[PDB]
Structure formats: structure tokens, C-alpha cells
Design a binder for these strands. Structure first.
Lengths: 142, 31, 246, 105
RNA sequence: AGCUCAUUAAUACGCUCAGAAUCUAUUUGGCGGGGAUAGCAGCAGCAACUCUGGUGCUAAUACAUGCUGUUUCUCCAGAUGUGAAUUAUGGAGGAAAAGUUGACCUCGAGGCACGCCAUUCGACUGAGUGACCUAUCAGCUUGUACUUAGGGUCUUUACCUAGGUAGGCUAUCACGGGUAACGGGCGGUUACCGUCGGACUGCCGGAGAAGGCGCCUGAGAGA
């Protein structure tokens, strides 16, 4: 459904005299079933829209579900320190765009992979969710 | 001289054109 | 901000070339060309510090400009022209034919060869694409755009190339059980028979074998498929990319 | 005593080129004398030989140096640098006086 | 290229990736297809300069002319190629000149253009991440954070202008302050672990030309 001033339109498709464009992203991901039976458009989705996925592929637990079609991960990594022969827990808050194909709560691990810049902060896009139930603030390395 | 230069330049272009169509037609049986 | 810069220093010049740390600061910057900066070897350096004909660099720029030298059919009066892997070098006056090709260790060597062999050369497919009227065509590790190339010509295939006419006579296919000289990294300059090809998700690995019976991997882009099953299509050096080991 | 050593026939500047390794005891060879000895050995004539850059060792009767020999007079007219020709037998003015051609039209 | 380290506490530098979001003179390989001025000649003006005025001519691989492609939009298909593109390419339509039209040197050979694609030297955009003190610096942030549409750019993005949400960072040290701070390869000291120094470092990358700021020419400059 199309609320705003501009008419929202699925690109690369002509009505002629509904249809939906759907894309296999590859790298071992099953292109999920709810993309193929749902009214949303989004050009910044991997599957429906026009964003090609490429390069580095991350995992981490979700913090925020607050913005429209954007979430925040925290990647969670150990840093070896040479002197003290011992690691320390570090983290990094990585904001990442979501397709409305997915259904994402707070506090569940996802995967992401990078694309072109969609904003200042966003350069990543969600390609697979695992659900989790039920919290965040665990430190979890993968 | 300058007409023999100009005719020759045209001919070479002509020569390239015929041998380019050969590189299609030689490989057309395989392609 | 950096631009394209002329003055190559020694030290920063590559470790192929066997340059003195002394004998001045600057080395000869290669001109732009088919081959890259790092892999190549100019013909200013070729006549100074292999064959040892031109003692000074003034004398080296003399003999290229007399037009004795021929890179790969053509004359080339430009000098400092990058020449690297499988290029023929015909030389006028006391003529000798060479092919430029790697040592055991990674260094360049220079090899007197028979004239009937030294007509042709090999050319690996780097990039395959379509363009102009549905026609497939191929770039090489030179940068020779071989258009109207035949089928069974995919990436990492060699092409034997006749030089007098712009032909591609054979095509040595990539496979298991096929000889391949490595041309980059740590295993640069080494012959191997290809036992395994490991596909790599996204951005792949290939495992090799000497006649001695050592074993070593590399990235796929480094291997140059030299000829089909033991016997290659080329005169190889002394030792034959085996490399000593005690 | 004239050793010829590390010897190669460079046909591109048609010259047969080498390094000489003469050993002398008692410490006394003149360059002219050297041409005499080398030219008999390579049937050369004295004018067609160039010998340059020859170096006695620390203390002992020894000397070694570069040199090369070519067919005809056609080599050293064109292939050689000018500093060997004036020596054998054959000033900032531009910087100052020269740049007046920009200062005056 | 050379010089210097005043800015800069990470945006720079290093080290991994990435271009499916880009530009590229020159080389190299493919594919292509007549009139008007400069010196020279002459008349003048300034205390002065590597400033010039004005008239009298003539040059061309300079400039303009001239015997299917390029750019962009719409539609139908979407490869033998890729991890993946309704991508490459093909066909059917319209437009536009922003245009490929060897109008060319030296004695049968050498050389020089023009255009498009690649290539080469690179450039430029983005990501991850590493490290100097300070709590007598605990809250900071309004284009600030997301979204949809546009402008602009070589392209992608609050880069900038709109409409719609109210978000982002922080005790795993945000934000602020200090530096007698250019970063790195490394150098001095040592039994090991470390520790101090790094303008230079016989190299690499960045920044600056008395202090800001602006701009032309060009493949490339805020020279």
C-alpha cells in the first residue's frame, strides 16, 4: 500500500494491457516464501528491490527495532592484547536495513551482508534471520 | 602520390573488412 | 593527492629484477603497456642486466632505437616497454630468439630457443564477455582482445597463438590432470600437475604436484595452464620449476 | 702475462667484449703495451681496441680492467661516449646567456 | 621530482576486502569510419615590467567544413557468463545533435590522426579493524538517526532541498579537554616479557607553500 505523496511502484515492471519481481541473491540463502505473496515494495530490499549483495558477511544479535525498515546489530568480538596474554570483550553497533519479508523481534541473532550506502550509517542488509525467545545483553561470539 | 595514398588507405580498410567477415564465417561452422 | 608518477626509485622497484641497492637511486620506470608494473620486465633492463650487451644505460637506449630488437613480431622503438611471461624477443644482428619465463625461485631468466617453436606463444583467458552482435570475446594476460573466439573457451583456459596471423590454434582446457606454472605469490615460478580444484564460495584454490613429489596450493588466478598432461607446449628452463630442498 | 676472461660476442654493436686479468710481479703494464699484447692475441690492430677502467690491487703486482674489440672503425665513432674519444685521440653559458631569450623577446 | 611537519587523536596512516555505484591523457590489442591569425615589416606611448596598442601580409597533423554508430527514453525477450543482476547482448519503436566522415608529413616501406571497447599507470567513492594521556571531562546529539521523492556528483550517501516518523552514540568510557602528536616501515635499550623514541629515518602514504578564501586551463590542480 502507498501512503505518501509519490506513487510507490515496483520498478522494472510494466502493467501493459498482480505481478511481482523476485530475485535469487545466492551465496547459499533460501529466498524466503513471504516475499512472493505480500504487498510491500521497497527498492532497498535485496529480494524485491534493486540492491545487489556483495562482500563481507556478518552475524550478531539485534538491539533496536524502532525505525521504519531498519534495525541495529551488535557484532561481538574478542581482542587479543599482546602484553597481558589475555582477551577482552569488545563490540560494534552496525545499523542494517531490513526487508518487510522478515519478521524480527528484539533480541535475536541475524545475518547481514554489505551493499552500496543506503544512508550515512546504513551500509548493510539483512539476508537471513534466526528467531530467538526469550534476551539481549548476552555476549555471543559468531 | 596523394591519390595513391588515399586509394591505398581505403583498400586496406577494405582488406580489413573482408578478413573480418572471414573471422565470422570461418568460426560460424563451429559457432 | 597522488597522481600517476614518473620517477621509480630502487628499493621500491620489484624484487624480480635483481637490482643493485647501490648504482644510483632511480630505476627505469616501465612505460604503460600490456603487462602490469609488478609482473613485467622492461627492455631497458633486459639488455643491461641479463645478456649484458649494453654496459651503460645510454648504450641500451642506442640499440633499441637502431631497430635491431623486436618484441613479439613488432619492432618497438619506444624502449622501457613492459615484457613479461611468454613474450617472444627476436633480435636483429647476431640474431637470437628468446622467450621470457620464470625461474624456480620467482626470478626472470632468458632462454635461447629453436625458431620453429619460437613462432607461437601462450595466452591465458582472464575475462570472458559478450559484445557487438552477440559475439563472445576474450581478454588475455597481455590484453589482446581475441574476438570471434570459438566455443570451449572459458576462463583460465590457455590459447596457442600463431603471431604471424592473429589466430588461436589450440585451446588447453582447465581441468584436473593438467600441467600449470604458477605466476604469482609465494609459489611463483613452479610447475605442477593439478590434483584438486577447490571451489571457493564467493571469492578458489588449486592443489599442485612436482615431479619430485612435493605438494602446494595457490589462488586460482596465479596458475597458467601450460600444457595437457605432463608434457607441456614449451621449452622449460634448467630444473623445470622443481626448486631445490635440503 | 695477459689473461682474457668472461668473454662474449656482442653482435648488436658488433664487438667482442671481455675483462682483462694481467698479473705482474715486481710491481712495474703500460696501456700502449697492453694494446700490443692484446692485438696480437685477437688479430685486431691497436686502434680497434678500447681498454678502459683498469685497477691495481692493494699492494701486490696485479691489475685487472675492462676492454672490448670490434670490427672496423664504425663502432667507436657512434657507439662510444665522447669522454673516451678526447682522452684517446679523436660551461653554464647556456644557463645564463640562454635565459635572456625569455627575458628579452 | 625536491623541501618542510605547522595543522590532524582518526575522516589521516596500516592491514584486509569492494566496485553489481565510478572516471582515466599516454602506451598496448581489438573493432571502426576555403578565411584568419602568430612571428616578420612599420608608426607611436610609461618614472617602470618577461605589459602592449594599431595596421600590412602568409602558415598547418592548430581551427571550421564532410562523400552506420554515440547519448537518452519506452516496450518485448534476458546468455554458452556469475555466489548473485529484467546484467552483457538481441529485437521493435521514437528523438538528438553533444557526431566515427585519414580533405596530413618524409624517401614499395616507416610515421600520424579521428571514434568506441578493453588494457596499463593510477585516481576517486565505501566497509571492517588497530593504536598517546585525561572522570577536578557523565551524559552527548537537531541534518543529529531512519524512511519516501528530488537536485547535485565521476558515481553512492544529509553531500543538499523537500514531505513522513523520532530516532542515533554512551560505564566494553560516549561527549568534552590536553598534547613540548604528522602516521607507517622501523631506530635505541634488553636474558625472556617489555619499555622509550620515531622532524629526518637515504623508503611508503598524507598535508602545506606569509595567513585564509576563490577560480581558469587540463586526463589529472581547489596548482
Amino acid at each position: 500500500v502507498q501512503t505518501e505523496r509519490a506513487f510507490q511502484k515496483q520498478p522494472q515492471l510494466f502493467l501493459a494491457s498482480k505481478q511481482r519481481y523476485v530475485k535469487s541473491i545466492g551465496l547459499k540463502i533460501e529466498t524466503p516464501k513471504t516475499a512472493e505473496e505480500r504487498e510491500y515494495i521497497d527498492a532497498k530490499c535485496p529480494f524485491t528491490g534493486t540492491v545487489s549483495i556483495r562482500g563481507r558477511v556478518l552475524r550478531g544479535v539485534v538491539v533496536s527495532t524502532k525505525m521504519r525498515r531498519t534495525i541495529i546489530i551488535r557484532r561481538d568480538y574478542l581482542q587479543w592484547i599482546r602484553k597481558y596474554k589475555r582477551f577482552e570483550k569488545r563490540h560494534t553497533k552496525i545499523p542494517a536495513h531490513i526487508s518487510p519479508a522478515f519478521l524480527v523481534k528484539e533480541g535475536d541473532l541475524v545475518t547481514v551482508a554489505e551493499c552500496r550506502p543506503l544512508s550515512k550509517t546504513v551500509h548493510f542488509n539483512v539476508i537471513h534471520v534466526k528467531p530467538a525467545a526469550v534476551d539481549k545483553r548476552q555476549f555471543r561470539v559468531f | 602520390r596523394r591519390v595513391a595514398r588515399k586509394n591505398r588507405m581505403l583498400k586496406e580498410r577494405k582488406e580489413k573488412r573482408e578478413a573480418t567477415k572471414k573471422k565470422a564465417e570461418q568460426y560460424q561452422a563451429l559457432l | 593527492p597522488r597522481c600517476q608518477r614518473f620517477h621509480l626509485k630502487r628499493l621500491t622497484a620489484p624484487h624480480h629484477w635483481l637490482l643493485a641497492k647501490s648504482a644510483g637511486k632511480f630505476a627505469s620506470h616501465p612505460s604503460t603497456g600490456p603487462h602490469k608494473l609488478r609482473e613485467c620486465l622492461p627492455i631497458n633492463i633486459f639488455l643491461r642486466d641479463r645478456l649484458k650487451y649494453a654496459l651503460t644505460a645510454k648504450e641500451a637506449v642506442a640499440i633499441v632505437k637502431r631497430r635491431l630488437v623486436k618484441v613479439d613480431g613488432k619492432v618497438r622503438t619506444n624502449y622501457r616497454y613492459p615484457t613479461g611471461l611468454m613474450d617472444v624477443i627476436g633480435l636483429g644482428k647476431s640474431n637470437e630468439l628468446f622467450r621470457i619465463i620464470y625461474d624456480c625461485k620467482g626470478r626472470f631468466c632468458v632462454h635461447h630457443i629453436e625458431a620453429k617453436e619460437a613462432s607461437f606463444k601462450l595466452l591465458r583467458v582472464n575475462q570472458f564477455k559478450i559484445g557487438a552482435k552477440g559475439i563472445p570475446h576474450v581478454v588475455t594476460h597481455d590484453g589482446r582482445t581475441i574476438s570471434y573466439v570459438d566455443p570451449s573457451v572459458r576462463v583460465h583456459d590457455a590459447l596457442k597463438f600463431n603471431i604471424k596471423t592473429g589466430e588461436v590454434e589450440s585451446v588447453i582446457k582447465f581441468k584436473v590432470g593438467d600441467v600449470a606454472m604458477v605466476t604469482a605469490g609465494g609459489n611463483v615460478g613452479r610447475v605442477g600437475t593439478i590434483q584438486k580444484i577447490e571451489k571457493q564460495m564467493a571469492s578458489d584454490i588449486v592443489h599442485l604436484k612436482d615431479t619430485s613429489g612435493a605438494v602446494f596450493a595457490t589462488r586460482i588466478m596465479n596458475v597458467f595452464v601450460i600444457g595437457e598432461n605432463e608434457h607441456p607446449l614449451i621449452s622449460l628452463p634448467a630444473r623445470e620449476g622443481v626448486r631445490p630442498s635440503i | 702475462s695477459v689473461h682474457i676472461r668472461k668473454y662474449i660476442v656482442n653482435k648488436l654493436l658488433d664487438r667482442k667484449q671481455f675483462v682483462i686479468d694481467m698479473q705482474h710481479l715486481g710491481a712495474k703494464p703500460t696501456r700502449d703495451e697492453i694494446k700490443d699484447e692484446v692485438a696480437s692475441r685477437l688479430k685486431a690492430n691497436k686502434d680497434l681496441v678500447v681498454i678502459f677502467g683498469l685497477e691495481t690491487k692493494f699492494g701486490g703486482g696485479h691489475t685487472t680492467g675492462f676492454g672490448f674489440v670490434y670490427d672496423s672503425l664504425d663502432a667507436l665513432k657512434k657507439t662510444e661516449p665522447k669522454h673516451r674519444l678526447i682522452k684517446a685521440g679523436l660551461r653554464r653559458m647556456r644557463k645564463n646567456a640562454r635565459r635572456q631569450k625569455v627575458k628579452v623577446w
